[PDB]
Design a binder for these strands. Structure first.
Ligand SMILES: [Mg+2]
Ligand SMILES: [Mg+2]
Ligand SMILES: [Mg+2]
Ligand SMILES: [Mg+2]
Ligand SMILES: [Mg+2]
Ligand SMILES: [Mg+2]
Ligand SMILES: [Mg+2]
Ligand SMILES: [Mg+2]
Ligand SMILES: [Mg+2]
Ligand SMILES: [Mg+2]
Ligand SMILES: [Mg+2]
Ligand SMILES: [Mg+2]
Ligand SMILES: [Mg+2]
Ligand SMILES: [Mg+2]
Ligand SMILES: [Mg+2]
Ligand SMILES: [Mg+2]
Ligand SMILES: [Mg+2]
Ligand SMILES: [Mg+2]
Ligand SMILES: [Mg+2]
Ligand SMILES: [Mg+2]
Ligand SMILES: [Mg+2]
Ligand SMILES: [Mg+2]
Ligand SMILES: [Mg+2]
Ligand SMILES: [Mg+2]
Ligand SMILES: [Mg+2]
Ligand SMILES: [Mg+2]
Ligand SMILES: [Mg+2]
Ligand SMILES: [Mg+2]
Ligand SMILES: [Mg+2]
Ligand SMILES: [Mg+2]
Ligand SMILES: [Mg+2]
Ligand SMILES: [Mg+2]
Ligand SMILES: [Mg+2]
Ligand SMILES: [Mg+2]
Ligand SMILES: [Mg+2]
Ligand SMILES: [Mg+2]
Lengths: 148, 200, 98, 52, 53, 203
RNA sequence: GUGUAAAGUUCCUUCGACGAGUCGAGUUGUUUGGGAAUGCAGCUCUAAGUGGGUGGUAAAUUCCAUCUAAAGCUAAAUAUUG
RNA sequence: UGACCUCAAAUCAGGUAGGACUACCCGCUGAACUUAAGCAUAUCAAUAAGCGGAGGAAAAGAAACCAACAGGGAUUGCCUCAGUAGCGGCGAGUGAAGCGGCAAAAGCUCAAAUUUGAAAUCUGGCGUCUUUGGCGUCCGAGUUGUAAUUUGAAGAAGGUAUCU
């Protein structure tokens, strides 16, 4: 609402809050990112270091679908087990019958190894796993089965 | 022009952008007229469904392999497996795609089953059919009667079987083999020609 | 099956049960036929050779295989087409030696 | 200009929150009276009538 | 041709195949595509080519 | 038939026979008017390939078009701008000479529809084209189920809008990544990519 | 209805024509996000028949994948200060 | 004494084009102000002005496509991709596409084939009728190719079980 703006409060005061010396002008200092190397260097150097220059190699025609690989950690892995059957699985899981967790079918490419698993065997199906994620899965008596 | 600790912006408004501003005031009007067009199209051809039967196909790329969706038309091989000519299939509510083929059996079998399910519910009228029988039918929605259904992710209990080699080691070895396949093959070819050429 | 069943390495990807694909007739496009072989042989007799093709033959006769290829690439444009043209002009020479 | 913002988005859950709050407020006699409705001769709120 | 077709239409009235009433024609072949195809099939005994095409 | 032989022989443009014929016909076409009516196709096979039929209502014009680039028609070469726009020579027309041939022929025979065109011959000053036109008011065309389409008024002066083969070639109307800018029309694509789309409930 | 007609359906054999100053190459100019060159155009060169194009780093060698140009028509969803 | 080819004439028989409108549409041609705190590449902008051409839509369109997947599948539009890959005195700036969800969905036609046991094709004149046309007839066009038959998804020519 315009009735809440300070434009309504500046009515009657000559300069509308812009100053009598400074005299609000069109574009003192330039337009946009003008003078970033000359008179706005003190701003870009302080607040945006790394702005100028090239780093790394180009990639013509980069298709981001190639690099799709969402991560799921181990402390979040049992959320992919059915909620209505999690508690039964946490009790009756053994080497003979352990829950299967299809991580790709839930939208994940790599299993990472942050956190702790329940000391319960699981079968984790993944495209990729980290070294520590698979070590933690095997320690609880589980296994990682690679899929594609 | 540059001041404070603020993000640096990219506001592409340096052309005559205001001459090309499309405001969709007609969203509700277009929704309503689109619904009316849809009713008219349905009532014109009832009880024949407004939607052609579409196949089910895997989405391409490594990001959408898991998903499966509606394709454009059934392949010539799929229609061949159910004994329908494409020219005939186009006249009984089945969509045809001459461009798609079946490298693998899974999608082919899914679409053959889908065509056979649609074919069992089909009733083709003729001259001997009277309006009493035609009025005995309701216009179904084919997109809902034969929906595209995602295969269920594997879940439940299975025996744990632990290979000696870890999955991480398997992935690392696969990467290494791919990375050095060419140079190893060149090295082996040179070694073989050397040790079988001077050994002549 | 045909893929390695894993997401990395050589021949990566999911295993599927292969189904044999009937080849499309459009893939026969490069194939030659009796009709076109016959018509092209008579047109060669009626038309003859191009000025650069006679120049190519002399270079091949004078043992300039390296020279002929450089000319044939300069004329036709690409190295792949130059190789086929030099091979075609050697076969023309091979058919004039009887 | 016509590309001024005219319609305003409200979170669906908050909109439902407010709808439930208004339905609940319809059963408070003091609120209905302050609202201006001549409801002084209705014996109780909510007023429920038969399906005829 | 009109007279021949009239005779053949008379013959089909009698119930005949109309091929027995008309003898097999022996005529001059013309048409560039037709004659070229005849030559390619070793069917032409003699070809006369115009000099001012 | 003979059309296959005609096709294979016109591809031998540097043979002695074809070179002789091109010399003679270039002289003869240069001796006529810049635009003239051809009593028949000089390449019947090429005309057939492009939709011509030996019927009443199909017309052939031969036209002669000056070769080279497009000199900027500014007086005394002064462009009155920035140095990037000071070029006068080595500038090129964005349409082909085939399209110019088609448009001038269609302008001359304004009662006909330009069906298509083809190259016939060449020298240093001119290229020579034969344009296949169709009469939309002739009943042999109007009653032809394969050529009724060009009678409809959306094909009025299709050669002036770039709807012939040469025009669609010069407009960049092809499929794929090499034609991203011009696939569906260059200016349409630019307008679509430079429009601010604002909805009722802004996202 | 002149349906001994027209069309489709299974299998075998022999075949299977498929667009040239065009593709493609160089260079020049313009243009593009297209970067040893995205498209277009001019000039010079100028093809082939499992050939040709594409596969976003120039080149040769070896493969693979995918389409089938240089001819043509076609409603709807889309645009709309007249 | 007559054909043919090419080229003319007629107030010849019958037709057709031009010009208008401007919001959208298909092309050509084409700036500079402006931004870069100067300025020349760049930017404005493949925009304004100028020229040619349409329709109720236009254009595009049934892959010489996208991809690199377990593959999608004409064209168009929306949301997203994405202010991203990239381009850029790598400065100011600029900048798409594939996938994905949806709206709408629709497919096809020639050229290249000997009808060769029969140019089977078509404009026009004349007559007649039930006239957006049918039938008859006569010139003409057309073999330097008009019909039927095939369009790569195929398909043709023979044989083939018969069925719909
Ligand atoms: Mg004060
Ligand atoms: Mg005052
Ligand atoms: Mg202030
Ligand atoms: Mg003041
Ligand atoms: Mg001061
Ligand atoms: Mg100040
Ligand atoms: Mg920037
Ligand atoms: Mg494929
Ligand atoms: Mg091929
Ligand atoms: Mg030459
Ligand atoms: Mg100027
Ligand atoms: Mg083709
Ligand atoms: Mg320009
Ligand atoms: Mg360039
Ligand atoms: Mg060039
Ligand atoms: Mg095409
Ligand atoms: Mg079109
Ligand atoms: Mg509107
Ligand atoms: Mg209006
Ligand atoms: Mg008159
Ligand atoms: Mg006008
Ligand atoms: Mg300009
Ligand atoms: Mg301005
Ligand atoms: Mg300035
Ligand atoms: Mg200034
Ligand atoms: Mg200045
Ligand atoms: Mg520009
Ligand atoms: Mg303008
Ligand atoms: Mg109108
Ligand atoms: Mg519309
Ligand atoms: Mg159209
Ligand atoms: Mg096709
Ligand atoms: Mg598509
Ligand atoms: Mg730009
Ligand atoms: Mg989609
Ligand atoms: Mg008549």
């Amino acid at each position: 609402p315009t009735r809440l703006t300070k434009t309504r409060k500046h009515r009657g005061n000559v300069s509308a809050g812009k100053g009598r010396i400074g005299k609000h002008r069109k574009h003192p200092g330039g337009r946009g990112k003008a003078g970033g190397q000359h008179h706005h260097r003190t701003n870009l150097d302080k607040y945006h270091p790394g702005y100028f220059g090239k780093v790394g190699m180009r990639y013509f025609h980069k298709q981001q679908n190639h690099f799709w690989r969402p991560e799921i950690n181990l402390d979040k892995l049992w959320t992919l087990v059915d909620s209505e059957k999690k508690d039964e699985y946490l009790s009756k899981s053994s080497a003979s019958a352990a829950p299967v967790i299809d991580t790709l079918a839930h939208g994940y490419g790599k299993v990472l190894g942050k956190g702790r698993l329940p000391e319960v065997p699981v079968i984790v199906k993944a495209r990729f796993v980290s070294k520590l994620a698979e070590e933690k899965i095997r320690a609880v008596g589980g296994v990682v089965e690679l899929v594609a | 022009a540059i001041s404070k600790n603020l993000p640096l912006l990219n506001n592409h408004f340096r052309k005559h952008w205001q001459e090309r501003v499309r405001v969709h005031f007609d969203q509700a009007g277009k929704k309503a007229s689109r619904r009316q067009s849809r009713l008219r199209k349905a009532a014109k051809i009832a009880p024949r469904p407004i939607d052609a039967l579409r196949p089910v196909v895997r989405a391409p790329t490594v990001k959408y392999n898991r998903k499966v969706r509606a394709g454009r038309g059934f392949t010539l091989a799929e229609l061949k497996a159910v004994g329908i000519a494409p020219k005939y299939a186009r006249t009984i509510g089945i969509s045809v795609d001459h461009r798609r083929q079946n490298k693998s059996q899974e999608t082919f079998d899914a679409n053959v089953a889908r065509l056979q399910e649609y074919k069992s519910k089909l009733v083709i009228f003729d001259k001997k059919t009277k309006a009493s029988e035609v009025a005995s039918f309701e216009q179904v929605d084919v997109s809902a009667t034969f929906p595209v259904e995602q295969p269920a992710p594997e879940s439940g209990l299975r025996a744990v079987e632990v290979p000696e080699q870890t999955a991480y080691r398997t992935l690392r070895l696969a990467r290494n083999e791919k990375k050095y396949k060419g140079i190893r093959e060149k090295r082996a070819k040179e070694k073989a020609e050397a040790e079988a050429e001077k050994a002549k | 099956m045909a893929k390695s069943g894993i997401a990395a390495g050589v021949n990566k990807g999911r295993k599927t049960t292969a189904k044999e694909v009937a080849p499309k007739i459009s893939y026969r496009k490069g194939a030659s036929s009796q009709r076109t072989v016959f018509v092209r042989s008579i047109v060669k007799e009626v038309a003859g050779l191009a000025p650069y093709e006679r120049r190519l033959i002399e270079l091949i006769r004078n043992a300039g295989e390296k020279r002929a290829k450089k000319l044939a690439k300069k004329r036709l444009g690409t190295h792949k087409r130059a190789l086929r043209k030099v091979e075609e002009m050697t076969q023309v020479i091979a058919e004039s030696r009887r | 200009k016509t590309w001024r913002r005219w319609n305003v988005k409200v979170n669906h859950n908050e909109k439902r929150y407010a709808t439930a709050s208004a339905i609940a407020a319809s059963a408070v006699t003091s609120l209905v009276l302050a609202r201006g409705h001549r409801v002084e001769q209705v014996k109780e709120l909510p007023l429920v009538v038969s399906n005829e | 041709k009109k007279e021949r077709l009239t005779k053949e239409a008379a013959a089909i009235a009698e119930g005949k195949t109309a091929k027995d009433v008309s003898p097999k024609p022996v005529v001059v072949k013309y048409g560039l595509n037709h004659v070229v195809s005849l030559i390619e099939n070793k069917k032409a005994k003699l070809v006369l080519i115009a000099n001012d095409v | 038939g003979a059309y296959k032989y005609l096709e294979e022989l016109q591809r031998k443009k540097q043979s002695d026979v074809m070179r002789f014929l091109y010399r003679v016909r270039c002289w003869e076409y240069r001796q006529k008017n810049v635009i003239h009516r051809a009593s028949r196709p000089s390449r019947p096979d090429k005309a057939r390939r492009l939709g011509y039929k030996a019927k009443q209502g199909f017309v052939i014009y031969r036209i002669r078009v000056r070769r080279g680039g497009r000199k900027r028609p500014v007086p005394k070469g002064a462009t009155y701008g920035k140095p990037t726009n000071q070029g006068v020579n080595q500038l090129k027309y964005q349409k082909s000479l085939r399209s110019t041939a088609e448009e001038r022929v269609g302008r001359r025979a304004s009662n006909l529809r330009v069906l298509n065109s083809y190259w016939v011959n060449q020298d240093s000053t001119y290229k020579y084209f034969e344009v296949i036109l169709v009469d939309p008011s002739h009943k042999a065309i109007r009653r032809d189920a394969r050529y009724n389409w060009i009678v409809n008024p959306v094909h009025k002066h299709r050669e002036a809008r770039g709807l012939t083969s040469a025009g669609k070639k010069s407009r960049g109307i092809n499929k794929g990544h090499l034609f991203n800018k011009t696939k569906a029309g260059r200016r349409h694509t630019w307008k679509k990519h430079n429009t601010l789309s604002l909805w009722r409930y802004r996202s």
